[PDB]
Scaffold this motif. Structure first.
Motif, PDB file in Angstrom:
ATOM      1  N   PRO A  71       0.856  -1.166   0.000  1.00  0.00           N
ATOM      2  CA  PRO A  71       0.000   0.000   0.000  1.00  0.00           C
ATOM      3  C   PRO A  71       0.905   1.233   0.000  1.00  0.00           C
ATOM      4  CG  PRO A  71      -0.492  -1.511   1.826  1.00  0.00           C
ATOM      5  CD  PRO A  71       0.905  -1.758   1.338  1.00  0.00           C
ATOM      6  N   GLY A  73       1.450   3.835   1.859  1.00  0.00           N
ATOM      7  CA  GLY A  73       2.079   4.469   3.011  1.00  0.00           C
ATOM      8  C   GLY A  73       3.551   4.191   3.124  1.00  0.00           C
ATOM      9  N   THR A 136       6.615  -5.456   1.419  1.00  0.00           N
ATOM     10  CA  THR A 136       6.204  -4.781   2.650  1.00  0.00           C
ATOM     11  C   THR A 136       5.298  -5.694   3.454  1.00  0.00           C
ATOM     12  OG1 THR A 136       4.320  -3.774   1.552  1.00  0.00           O
ATOM     13  CG2 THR A 136       6.392  -2.501   1.613  1.00  0.00           C
ATOM     14  N   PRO A 168       9.431  -7.524   4.681  1.00  0.00           N
ATOM     15  CA  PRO A 168       8.293  -6.969   5.350  1.00  0.00           C
ATOM     16  C   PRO A 168       8.735  -6.422   6.700  1.00  0.00           C
ATOM     17  CG  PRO A 168       8.264  -9.341   5.612  1.00  0.00           C
ATOM     18  CD  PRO A 168       9.335  -9.005   4.587  1.00  0.00           C
TER      19      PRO A 168
ATOM     20  N   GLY C  45       7.780   0.554  11.558  1.00  0.00           N
ATOM     21  CA  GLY C  45       7.893   1.683  10.631  1.00  0.00           C
ATOM     22  C   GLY C  45       6.595   2.460  10.579  1.00  0.00           C
ATOM     23  N   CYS C  46       5.470   1.769  10.803  1.00  0.00           N
ATOM     24  CA  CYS C  46       4.142   2.404  10.717  1.00  0.00           C
ATOM     25  C   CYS C  46       4.021   3.482  11.777  1.00  0.00           C
ATOM     26  CB  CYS C  46       3.068   1.366  10.935  1.00  0.00           C
ATOM     27  SG  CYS C  46       3.111  -0.012   9.737  1.00  0.00           S
ATOM     28  N   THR C 104      -3.147  -1.490  11.216  1.00  0.00           N
ATOM     29  CA  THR C 104      -2.335  -1.254  10.058  1.00  0.00           C
ATOM     30  C   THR C 104      -2.641  -2.273   9.008  1.00  0.00           C
ATOM     31  OG1 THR C 104      -0.549  -2.612  10.917  1.00  0.00           O
ATOM     32  CG2 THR C 104      -0.432  -0.214  11.373  1.00  0.00           C
ATOM     33  N   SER C 143      -4.526   0.078   5.402  1.00  0.00           N
ATOM     34  CA  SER C 143      -3.907   1.066   4.529  1.00  0.00           C
ATOM     35  C   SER C 143      -4.168   0.827   3.074  1.00  0.00           C
ATOM     36  CB  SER C 143      -2.413   1.118   4.742  1.00  0.00           C
ATOM     37  OG  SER C 143      -1.871  -0.155   4.549  1.00  0.00           O
TER      38      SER C 143
HETATM   39  S1  CLF Z   1       6.295  -1.805   9.287  1.00  0.00           S
HETATM   40 FE1  CLF Z   1       3.089   0.822   5.197  1.00  0.00          FE
HETATM   41  S2  CLF Z   1       3.094   2.607   6.639  1.00  0.00           S
HETATM   42 FE2  CLF Z   1       2.340   0.720   7.698  1.00  0.00          FE
HETATM   43  S3  CLF Z   1       0.076   0.774   7.584  1.00  0.00           S
HETATM   44 FE3  CLF Z   1       1.129  -0.556   5.993  1.00  0.00          FE
HETATM   45  S4  CLF Z   1       1.058   0.981   4.135  1.00  0.00           S
HETATM   46 FE4  CLF Z   1       0.892   2.287   6.061  1.00  0.00          FE
HETATM   47 FE5  CLF Z   1       7.563  -0.992   7.495  1.00  0.00          FE
HETATM   48  S5  CLF Z   1       6.922  -2.418   5.751  1.00  0.00           S
HETATM   49 FE6  CLF Z   1       5.565  -0.570   5.714  1.00  0.00          FE
HETATM   50  S6  CLF Z   1       6.512   1.011   7.064  1.00  0.00           S
HETATM   51 FE7  CLF Z   1       4.974  -0.226   8.260  1.00  0.00          FE
HETATM   52  S7  CLF Z   1       3.390  -1.182   6.598  1.00  0.00           S
HETATM   53 FE8  CLF Z   1       5.252  -2.554   7.353  1.00  0.00          FE
END
Ligand code: CLF
Ligand SMILES: [Mg+2]
Ligand SMILES: [Mg+2]
Ligand SMILES: [S]
Lengths: 473, 113, 465
Positions: A71, A73, A136, A168, C45-46, C104, C143
């Motif tokens: 996604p 984000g 991810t 991930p 990371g979220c 998430t 998301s």
């Molecule tokens: S730990 Fe990504 S920010 Fe998240 S809720 Fe998913 S779209 Fe939004 Fe690391 S890989 Fe990414 S940043 Fe998190 S989801 Fe995982």
């Protein structure tokens, strides 16, 4: 001894992560646990494995699409946050790519959505023919096989080359796992898939430097002066194809042994290329490093000419800062390696006393190094959290903190200045000139009129507003 | 005295060098042996080994340490060849003890990098 | 041939996303509550990347925690990470009162039972802390739909549901509820002044004024949301709700109308003069209070300033706008008031079926004398690609993650919306209201003026305008 902070009374496992170095201790009995699970709800500083692969290593490259399969984000969050310039107009910082995963892709799969995104990205930018694809959290969970998609895309589009990373954010405990997965896949799949012209008798790769504010370009002025060809930089101001040529180098020079030691170890195992660890931060450290490189190649006199000139240029300024920074107390709250690259170099070259250090994601290896180089009476913290930071500040009363901007903005309320220990204030910070830049920012941070002004309560009849006299090297 | 000299060498390596802190046991062992054999040669006026790439890199690491030891420690220019060799054998043992035998670093024996 | 057209992005992938994901917006909602630490259930990371994002916009720290989902939870489920995270927060932050538990992508995919974890934690907390009440709000923010805009709205609604479920309806407050949406501290300061001048008691949800916190002699940290549990609970008792943003809080106003019969009034977001006028008329209607002379004066000062700019520097200039949908549509109306021509509006998420029904689209279709393309589900590559294909723009209005588009195309750019990290102090400068319209117009002119000087484009003309 190991320390149970007051703020950790209800999470007492934190004591094995915090060492206060005391006289006569056998440090082997007090090595913090590191690289273990995070405690939920702590406000740990840690990030995720995907960060370590895409933001820290892969995304540095100047000529590569960074396709984040997930996604949007994860893509948004890794864009406009790094300071790794290039010599091609900063392509790496201007763009980020997502497959924009939707609910239907969770239900039915995301492989065709990835494949379509990949061809769109190549169509939108026809000059770019290289790509890294990252998983991810949710694309790992649904089992999309990004390596298989990339294989199909390369079959269908023979002028592109694609690399894939399974990273991930729930994998490992921190960004460290992303480093490992990327390093090992790159050496397994892409090293020795092309070759370049060799133009010098002396060749090396520089491993574990990500060109923060131009660090790599500054060090390149040394290699060019010495007549050393750098086959590949892993990955500062680098290219995808240069990294395919890493097997050609005679020597691997490592700065970031944490993120990038893996590929240096595998290059030694597979190709016989020796691993030389240096410190490319620190004034006298940089001189040691140059002397080692030049001893390996048999160009010692060229090294001594370079060192002499650099000391003539920069040492007087460094020494001006040392006079004014001597005895200042510093904290370093960063990823891990900068703790062991900086604790003794600021002490030797600037007279600065590092009184507290925290590593987000360091391994026990990193703690061995920092405790070997670090001071007695200093706190050494694995996976520190925000309440611990406040308690540590009350214990050691630093004059300056090298940390990220958000924590810098927090400690500003306590009238403690910061330097950005990650992305720098006014860098670069590597090399001879770079340590002078670091010293200048530290000096301007601490000897700052605003800190003195903030302490004055104008309502107190008894108080006046002071003036401070500053200086410049 | 011989323990004071050995303590001087060990404190120098611990605060300065990185080669004893490589990723795995076998690499720490290789580097402790390879670098300190060259240090011994350089501190006793013997021809350094500079044939293979690995030998050339042990020479490079050793040159830094030999030059620093001569600069920091007057004794290192007073003691004889056999005394230097004895000290460096004791230093190998000490470095293996603290970086390998008694290190709690749990990755040191992981077969894969 | 005069056409306002809505169209989707024609690519499946995204290049240069306009918005973050839902959980980021939920975090933003939560940080405006006093004695609140959101708990983001998912990978680390979220949380950490969003705390950074807030530091980029505000130049401040805000507290948000993670459940630190790791590999074992991805195989067996993550409920134990939520439950531990709640207790670790409660034990270490004695003043904590509110924890939105924000899901998430990971924790939505694996199906952790958030409401079941809340029942466990409520029991644990009641036993361990008998004299404390902590409100745990379940916030479902996958998301892989919507955006941070939708996530903001979802979190506000869930927090309000949670707290009002606990306290119910009491005595009438005589106050308005006001949901301004996702706005800056400077917008909140302006709205407080409007209500004070009109003698209208109101709670602004959330009250983020103190995000711009002082560096004080006593080293106190005051960087907090000011909206309390009590303030949210009192929403049940209001005279009426004023919702300024269809996509950023109106659904909470509707919920309060369904549950507590508090009538909700949704108005156009108050960008520009007419939208501000109409907001104040609605306040007057619902309160019975007159619009004060002080607002007639502020309006007139704004108009006087804008009149120095509109036909001289703005007329016939072509503008692209991107940002939150309420902001984009409101700024397009403002632009028209000052003779700018907003020819390209970009809205960054999958809510097109709602945007097609927005009455402001019709207000544009019935007023514009130039074609308008409204691209929904847009990314910022949609802007750069259109410029590369020949779209001639005189101005971009948008947030800082579009900066390189403007820099490389040599187009002046005014920073609006979220995040505006690449200029100083913008979080303190209103954009809504009369003062905000004036401030926006003068930013636009000053950006054009600097551009004229740097490009030597009739730079001599800046003397006797
Ligand atoms: S730990 Fe990504 S920010 Fe998240 S809720 Fe998913 S779209 Fe939004 Fe690391 S890989 Fe990414 S940043 Fe998190 S989801 Fe995982
Ligand atoms: Mg020591
Ligand atoms: Mg006037
Ligand atoms: S991390």
């Amino acid at each position: 001894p190991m320390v149970l902070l007051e703020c950790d009374k209800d999470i007492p496992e934190r004591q094995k992560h915090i060492y206060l170095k005391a006289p006569n201790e056998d440090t082997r009995e007090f090595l913090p646990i590191a690289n273990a699970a995070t405690i939920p709800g702590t406000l740990s500083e840690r990030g995720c494995a995907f960060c370590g692969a895409k933001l820290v290593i892969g995304g540095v490259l100047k000529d590569t699409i960074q396709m984040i399969h997930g996604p949007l984000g994860c893509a948004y969050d890794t864009w406009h946050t790094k300071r790794y310039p290039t010599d091609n107009g900063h392509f790496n910082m201007k763009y980020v790519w997502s497959t924009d995963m939707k609910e239907s892709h969770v239900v039915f799969g995301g492989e065709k959505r990835l494949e379509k995104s990949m061809h769109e990205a190549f169509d939108e930018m026809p000059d770019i023919k290289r790509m890294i694809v990252y998983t991810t959290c949710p694309t790992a969970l649904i089992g999309d096989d990004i390596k298989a998609v990339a294989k199909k895309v390369m079959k269908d589009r023979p002028d592109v080359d694609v690399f894939t990373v399974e990273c991930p954010g729930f994998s490992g405990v921190s960004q460290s796992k992303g480093h490992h997965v990327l390093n090992i896949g790159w050496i397994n799949e892409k090293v020795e898939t092309m070759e370049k012209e060799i133009t010098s008798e002396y060749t090396m790769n520089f491993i574990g430097d990500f060109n923060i504010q131009g660090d790599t370009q500054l060090l390149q002025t040394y290699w060019d002066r010495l007549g050393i060809q750098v086959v590949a930089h892993f990955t500062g101001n680098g290219t995808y194809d240069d990294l395919r040529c890493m097997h050609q180098a005679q020597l691997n020079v490592v700065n970031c042994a944490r993120s990038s030691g893996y590929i240096a170890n595998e290059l030694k195992k597979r190709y016989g290329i020796p691993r030389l660890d240096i410190d490319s931060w620190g004034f006298n450290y940089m001189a040691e490093g140059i002397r080692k490189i030049c001893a390996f190649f048999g160009i010692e006199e060229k090294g001594e000419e370079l060192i002499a000139e650099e000391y003539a240029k920069w040492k007087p300024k460094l020494d001006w800062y040392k006079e004014r920074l001597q005895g200042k107390k510093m904290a370093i709250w960063t990823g891990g390696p900068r703790l062991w690259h900086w604790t003794k170099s600021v002490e030797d070259d600037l007279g600065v006393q590092v009184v507290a250090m925290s590593s987000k994601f360091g391994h026990e290896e990193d703690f061995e190094k920092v405790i070997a180089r670090g001071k007695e009476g200093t706190y050494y913290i694995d996976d520190g959290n925000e309440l611990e930071f406040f308690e540590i500040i009350d214990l050691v009363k630093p004059d300056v903190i090298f940390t990220g901007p958000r924590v810098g903005e927090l400690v500003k309320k306590l009238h403690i200045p910061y330097v950005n220990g990650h992305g720098y204030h006014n860098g670069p910070y590597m090399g001879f000139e770079g340590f002078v830049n670091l010293a200048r920012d530290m000096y301007n941070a601490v000897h700052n009129p605003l800190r003195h002004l903030a302490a004055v309560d104008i309502r107190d009849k008894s108080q006046t507003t002071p003036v401070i006299v500053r200086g410049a090297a | 005295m011989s323990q004071s000299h050995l303590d001087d060498l060990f404190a120098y390596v611990e605060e300065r060098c990185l080669w004893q802190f490589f990723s795995r046991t076998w690499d720490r062992e290789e580097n402790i042996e390879g670098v300190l054999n060259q240090v011994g040669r350089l501190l006793t006026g013997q021809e350094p080994l500079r044939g293979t790439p690995q030998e050339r890199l042990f020479y490079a690491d050793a040159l830094a340490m030999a030059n620093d030891v001569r600069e920091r420690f007057p004794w290192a220019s007073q003691v004889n060849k056999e005394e230097i060799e004895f000290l460096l054998d004791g230093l190998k043992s000490r470095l293996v003890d603290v970086t390998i035998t008694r290190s709690t670093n749990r990755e040191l024996n992981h077969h894969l990098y | 041939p005069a056409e306002v057209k809505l169209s989707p992005r024609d690519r499946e992938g995204i290049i240069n996303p306009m918005y973050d994901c839902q959980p980021a917006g939920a975090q933003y909602a939560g940080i405006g509550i006093k004695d609140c630490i959101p708990l983001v259930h998912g990978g680390q990371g979220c949380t950490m990347f969003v705390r950074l994002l807030f530091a980029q916009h505000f130049k401040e720290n805000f507290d948000v925690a993670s459940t630190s989902l790791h590999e074992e939870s991805a195989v067996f489920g993550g409920a134990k990470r939520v439950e531990e995270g709640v207790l670790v927060l409660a034990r270490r932050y004695p003043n904590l009162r509110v924890i939105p538990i924000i899901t998430t992508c990971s924790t939505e995919v694996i199906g952790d039972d958030i409401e079941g974890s809340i029942r466990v934690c409520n029991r644990a907390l009641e036993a361990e802390f008998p004299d404390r009440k902590i409100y745990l709000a379940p916030v479902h923010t996958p998301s892989f739909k919507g955006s941070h805009v939708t996530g903001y709205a979802e979190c506000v609604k869930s927090v309000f549901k949670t707290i009002t479920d606990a306290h119910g309806k009491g005595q009438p407050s005589g106050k308005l509820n006001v949901f301004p949406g996702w706005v800056n501290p400077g917008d909140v300061v302006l709205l407080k002044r409007y209500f004070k001048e009109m003698d209208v008691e109101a709670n602004i949800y959330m009250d983020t004024e103190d995000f711009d916190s002082p560096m004080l002699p006593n080293k106190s940290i005051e960087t907090h949301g000011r909206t309390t549990v009590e303030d949210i609970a009192d929403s049940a008792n209001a005279l009426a709700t004023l919702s300024l943003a269809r996509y950023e809080g109106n659904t909470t106003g509707e919920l309060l109308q369904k549950t507590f019969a508090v009538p909700n009034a949704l108005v156009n977001t108050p960008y520009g003069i007419k939208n501000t006028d109409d907001m104040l008329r609605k306040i007057a209607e619902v309160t019975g209070k007159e619009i004060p002379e002080s607002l007639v004066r502020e309006r007139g000062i704004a108009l006087d300033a804008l009149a120095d700019l509109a036909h001289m520097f703005f007329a016939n200039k072509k503008v692209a706008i991107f940002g939150h949908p309420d902001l984009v549509l409101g700024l397009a109306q403002f632009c028209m008031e000052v003779e700018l021509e907003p020819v390209l509006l970009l809205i960054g998420d999958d809510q097109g079926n709602k945007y097609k029904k927005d009455p402001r689209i019709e207000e544009l279709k019935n007023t514009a004398h130039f074609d308008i393309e409204i691209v929904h589900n847009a990314d910022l590559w949609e802007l750069e690609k259109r410029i590369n294909a020949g779209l001639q723009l005189d101005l971009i209005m948008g947030h800082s993650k579009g900066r390189y588009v403007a820099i490389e195309a040599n187009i002046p750019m005014v920073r609006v919306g979220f995040p505006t990290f690449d200029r100083a102090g913008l979080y303190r400068k209103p954009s809504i209201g009369y003062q905000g319209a004036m401030e926006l117009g003068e930013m636009i002119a000053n950006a054009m003026f600097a551009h004229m000087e740097y490009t030597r484009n009739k730079e001599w003309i800046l003397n006797t305008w």
